[PDB]
C-alpha cells in the first residue's frame, strides 16, 4: 500500500511548495491521479485476499472503500473553494493539509492487517476531523459539535482498546489472517458479554446506532462542506468496516447479543426517517437521513448471512456517494442564500434548471430506485432479514414508504412551487458546482453495469 | 372587518353560484335564480340592525345545509383545475441581469430598451421613498393602500414589481 | 364602496405604466439576432427543391426521410442485434430457448420424415 501512502504524503509538499494561486489546481489534479491508480486494487482472487506485506492487505471489502476514499478528496477540494476564497493563504494550505492527512489515515485504516494498527488509525481520524469542524465551521455551535463528536467516539473507543489488547494476550495475535484460523467460539458468560460490548460499541457509535447518534446532527451540520462529505461518506463506514471484521471472533454470542441492537436499528430507522418529514434545516434533514440508511447496515452485519454481507457492502458504498452528493447540492444553495432553512428558497427549478436535474437524480438514488446500487444493497439486506424473521418485512417496507416521502418532500420544497420573491441573487450554477454533482452521480450510476466490484468478499 | 352590506352581497353571489351548480340547465337556473332574488328583495328596507342580523345568520345556516357538495369553479380560480398552472413559467425580471453578454446580444433592442426602465427605476426611487416617509403618520402606516404620484414626471411609489410582474401566459 | 378619489388615479397611473411595459416585451423584426450558421449541402437542396407543390414530386421527400429512418433506425439495429444474437448469444448454452413446436397427428417431421399416426376413427356426428 506504499504506492498509495507515499503519493498521498507528497500532496503536502505539493500544496505548500506550489504558487499562491495554484494550490487548488495542483492539489486537485494530483489527487485525481492518485484516485486513478487505486483501480489497481481490483486484482482480487476468488479464494485469497491480496496480501501485500505484514502490515497491509486488501480484500474485496477494503478495495471499494479505498477507491471511495481516494475519489472523494478531489471532490472535497472542489467544494471548499468558494467559502475559502477569502481566507489567509497559510490557513488555506493548513485546511488542505488536514484533508490530505485524513486520507492518509483512512487508506491505512482500511488496509491494516493488525487490529491494533487498525485502532490507532481508526482513532487518528478524529484529530483532523475535529480540527476541520471547529476551526473552519461557520456557526457558534461548531464548538459544541466537536465536543459531542469527540467524547461520543472516545467513550466507545477506549473500551475497544482494552478488549483488543485482551484478545491479543489470549489469542497471541491481532493479525486478521491469523484470527481467521485461530478463532475460537465465545462461551456464554457474563465476562464475554462485556467483551462483546467492548468490541462493538466503539463501532456502533460511529455508524451511528439509534440512541447514540446525537453527535451526528451536530457534527454533520456545523461542519464545512468538505467536512460533511467525508464525515457522511467514509467516516460513518469505519464503524461498518470495523464490525464486518470483528464479528469473526464473536460467534456464537452474536446470536443473542444482537437483539437489542437489531431492535434499536429496525425501530430506529422508522424514527429517524420520520424525523426527516419535519426538519426545518435542509442540511440537518440529510444528516438524519444517514442514520436510517446506516441502520440497515447494522442489521445487515448482525445477522451474518452471505446475502446480508453483500448488501451491507453495497449499501455503504452506495450511501457514500449519495450522502456526499446531497450535502453538495444543499451547499450550492447555501453559497447563494447563506442560510440552511429549507423553506427559505423555493421553486429553484425555475432559476436553476440543470441543478434541479441533479436534485432529481440525488433523490431517486436516495429512495433506492432500481436498478441503482442503492436499491441493490437495500434489496439484499431485506431478503436476508426476511429469512432471519418474516415479520421484519413490515418494518423494512414501512421505511421504504417513509424514505420516499421525505426524499421527495425535500425535492418539492426547494425545487417546486413559487420562487421566493425577495431572493434576487440566485446566480446561474457555476461549472465547478455542476461538475461536482456529475463526479458523484456518474460513477454511482456506472456501478450498476458491473456491481460485483462493490459486493464484498462474499460475492 | 366587513360591513353588513358586504356580507349580504357575498351570500347572494355564493348562493347563485351553488344554485347554478345545482340547476345546471340555464332556463331552470333562470327560474330559480329570480325566486332567490325575490327572497332577498323582501328584506332590503329592513332598518332593524338586530332583526336584520338574525336573517343573515339564518340565511347562512340555510346556505350551508343546501350548498352544493361540489360547486362549479372557474379553471383559474382557487380550486379550479388551472390555478397556479402557469406559475412554473413566470420568471422574475432580475434573472435577465445574469444572462451572458453573448446571450443579451440576441436581443439588442429589448435590452437597450430595458436599461431605460432600470434608469427610470433608479431615478424615481428617491422621490418614491421621500413621498412615503412624509405622508406616513408618526406611528407608521395604518393600512396597506398606497398614495399615487402627486406631481408630473413622478411615478407612483412602489410601482416596480406591480408594473413589471410576469405575464399570465409567459410561455 | 367604489374607488376612493385617489385609488382611481393610482390604477390609471399604473395601468398606463403596465400597458407600456407589455409593449416593450415585443420583439423587433430582426430579433432574435441569430449568429451566422452553415447548413449541409443536402439541406440546401430541399430548401428550394420543395417550394413547388407538385404532389407527384412531394412524396419523394416523404419517402426520402422515411427511407433514411428505416435504414438508420431499423436496418442498422437489426444488423447489430442479429449479429449479436447469432454469433455471441446463441453460441452460449440455453441463452435462447424455444418452446418446441406442436406435433399434430398427421404431421411429417422435417428431421427424420417420421409420420405420426393419425387419430382413430371418431363417432362422427353432424351437429
Amino acid at each position: 500500500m506504499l504506492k498509495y501512502i507515499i503519493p498521498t504524503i507528497m500532496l503536502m509538499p505539493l500544496t505548500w511548495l506550489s504558487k499562491n494561486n495554484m494550490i487548488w489546481v495542483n492539489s486537485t489534479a494530483h489527487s485525481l491521479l492518485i484516485s486513478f491508480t487505486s483501480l489497481l486494487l481490483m486484482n482480487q482472487f476468488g479464494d485469497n485476499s491480496l496480501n501485500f506485506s505484514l502490515l497491509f492487505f486488501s480484500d474485496s471489502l477494503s478495495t471499494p472503500l479505498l477507491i471511495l476514499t481516494m475519489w472523494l478528496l478531489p471532490l472535497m477540494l472542489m467544494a471548499s473553494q468558494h467559502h475559502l476564497s477569502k481566507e489567509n493563504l497559510t490557513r488555506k494550505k493548513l485546511f488542505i493539509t488536514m484533508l490530505i492527512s485524513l486520507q492518509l489515515f483512512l487508506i491505512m485504516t482500511f488496509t491494516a492487517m493488525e487490529l491494533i494498527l487498525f485502532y490507532i488509525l481508526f482513532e487518528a481520524t478524529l484529530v483532523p476531523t475535529l480540527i476541520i469542524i471547529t476551526r473552519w465551521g461557520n456557526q457558534t455551535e461548531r464548538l459544541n459539535a466537536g465536543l459531542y463528536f469527540l467524547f461520543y467516539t472516545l467513550a466507545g473507543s477506549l473500551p475497544l482498546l482494552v478488549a483488543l489488547i485482551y484478545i491479543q494476550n489470549t489469542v497471541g495475535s491481532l493479525n486478521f489472517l491469523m484470527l481467521q484460523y485461530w478463532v475460537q467460539p465465545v462461551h456464554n458468560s457474563w465476562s464475554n458479554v462485556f467483551m462483546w460490548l467492548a468490541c462493538m460499541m466503539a463501532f456502533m457509535v460511529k455508524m451511528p446506532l439509534y440512541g447514540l447518534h446525537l453527535w451526528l446532527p451536530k457534527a454533520h451540520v456545523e461542519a464545512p462542506i468538505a467536512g460533511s462529505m467525508v464525515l457522511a461518506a467514509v467516516l460513518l463506514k469505519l464503524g461498518g468496516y470495523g464490525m464486518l471484521r470483528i464479528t469473526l471472533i464473536l460467534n456464537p454470542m452474536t446470536d443473542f447479543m444482537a437483539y437489542p441492537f437489531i431492535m434499536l436499528s429496525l425501530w430506529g430507522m422508522i424514527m429517524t426517517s420520520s424525523i426527516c418529514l419535519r426538519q426545518t434545516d435542509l442540511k440537518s434533514l440529510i444528516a438524519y437521513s444517514s442514520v436510517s440508511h446506516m441502520a440497515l447496515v447494522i442489521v445487515a452485519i448482525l445477522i451474518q448471512t452471505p446475502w446480508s454481507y453483500m448488501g451491507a457492502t453495497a449499501l455503504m458504498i452506495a450511501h457514500g456517494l449519495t450522502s456526499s452528493m446531497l450535502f453538495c447540492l444543499a451547499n450550492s444553495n447555501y453559497e447563494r442564500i447563506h442560510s440552511r432553512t429549507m423553506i427559505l428558497a423555493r421553486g429553484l427549478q425555475t432559476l436553476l434548471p440543470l441543478m434541479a436535474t441533479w436534485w432529481l437524480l440525488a433523490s431517486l438514488t436516495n429512495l433506492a430506485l432500481p436498478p441503482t446500487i442503492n436499491l441493490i444493497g437495500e434489496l439484499f439486506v431485506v431478503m436476508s432479514t426476511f429469512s432471519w424473521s418474516n415479520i421484519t418485512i413490515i418494518l423494512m417496507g414501512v421505511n421504504m414508504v417513509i424514505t420516499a416521502l421525505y426524499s421527495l418532500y425535500m425535492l418539492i420544497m426547494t425545487q417546486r412551487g413559487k420562487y421566493t420573491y425577495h431572493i434576487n441573487n440566485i446566480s446561474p450554477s457555476f461549472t465547478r458546482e455542476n461538475a461536482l454533482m456529475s463526479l458523484h452521480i456518474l460513477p454511482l450510476l456506472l456501478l450498476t453495469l458491473n456491481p460485483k466490484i462493490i459486493l464484498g468478499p462474499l460475492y | 372587518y366587513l360591513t353588513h352590506q358586504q356580507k349580504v352581497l357575498r351570500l347572494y353571489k355564493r348562493a347563485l353560484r351553488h344554485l347554478e351548480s345545482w340547476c345546471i340547465h340555464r332556463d331552470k337556473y333562470r327560474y330559480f335564480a329570480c325566486l332567490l332574488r325575490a327572497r332577498f328583495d323582501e328584506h332590503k328596507n329592513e332598518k332593524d340592525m338586530v332583526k336584520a342580523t338574525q336573517l343573515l345568520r339564518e340565511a347562512e345556516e340555510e346556505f350551508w345545509h343546501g350548498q352544493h357538495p361540489q360547486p362549479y369553479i372557474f379553471p383559474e380560480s382557487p380550486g379550479g383545475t388551472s390555478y397556479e398552472r402557469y406559475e412554473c413559467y413566470k420568471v422574475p425580471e432580475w434573472c435577465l441581469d445574469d444572462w451572458h453578454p453573448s446571450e443579451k446580444a440576441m436581443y439588442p433592442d429589448y435590452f437597450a430598451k430595458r436599461e431605460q426602465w432600470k434608469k427610470l427605476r433608479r431615478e424615481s426611487w428617491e422621490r418614491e421613498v421621500k413621498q412615503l416617509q412624509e405622508e406616513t403618520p408618526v406611528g407608521g402606516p395604518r393600512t396597506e393602500a398606497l398614495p399615487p404620484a402627486r406631481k408630473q414626471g413622478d411615478l407612483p411609489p412602489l410601482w416596480w414589481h406591480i408594473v413589471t410582474r410576469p405575464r399570465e401566459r409567459p410561455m | 364602496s367604489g374607488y376612493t378619489p385617489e385609488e382611481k388615479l393610482r390604477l390609471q397611473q399604473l395601468r398606463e405604466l403596465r400597458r407600456r411595459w407589455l409593449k416593450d416585451q415585443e420583439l423587433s423584426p430582426r430579433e432574435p439576432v441569430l449568429p451566422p450558421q452553415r447548413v449541409s449541402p443536402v439541406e440546401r437542396f430541399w430548401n428550394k427543391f420543395l417550394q413547388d407543390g407538385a404532389l407527384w414530386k412531394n412524396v419523394i421527400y416523404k419517402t426520402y426521410r422515411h427511407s433514411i429512418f428505416a435504414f438508420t433506425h431499423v436496418l442498422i439495429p437489426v444488423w447489430i442485434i442479429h449479429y449479436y444474437l447469432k454469433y455471441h448469444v446463441t453460441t452460449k448454452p440455453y441463452t435462447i430457448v424455444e418452446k418446441k413446436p406442436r406435433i399434430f397427428p398427421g404431421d411429417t417431421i422435417l428431421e427424420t420424415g417420421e409420420v405420426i399416426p393419425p387419430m382413430k376413427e371418431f363417432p362422427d356426428q353432424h351437429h
Binding site: 432559476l351 434548471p353 446561474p428 455542476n434 | 420568471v91 425580471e93 434573472c95 446571450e103 | 415585443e26
Partner: peptide
C-alpha cells in the same frame, strides 16, 4: 405578434 420570453440564463 412575437413576445420576448423571460428565461433564466441557459448559457452556463
Amino acid at each position: 405578434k412575437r413576445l420576448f420570453i423571460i428565461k433564466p440564463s441557459g448559457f452556463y
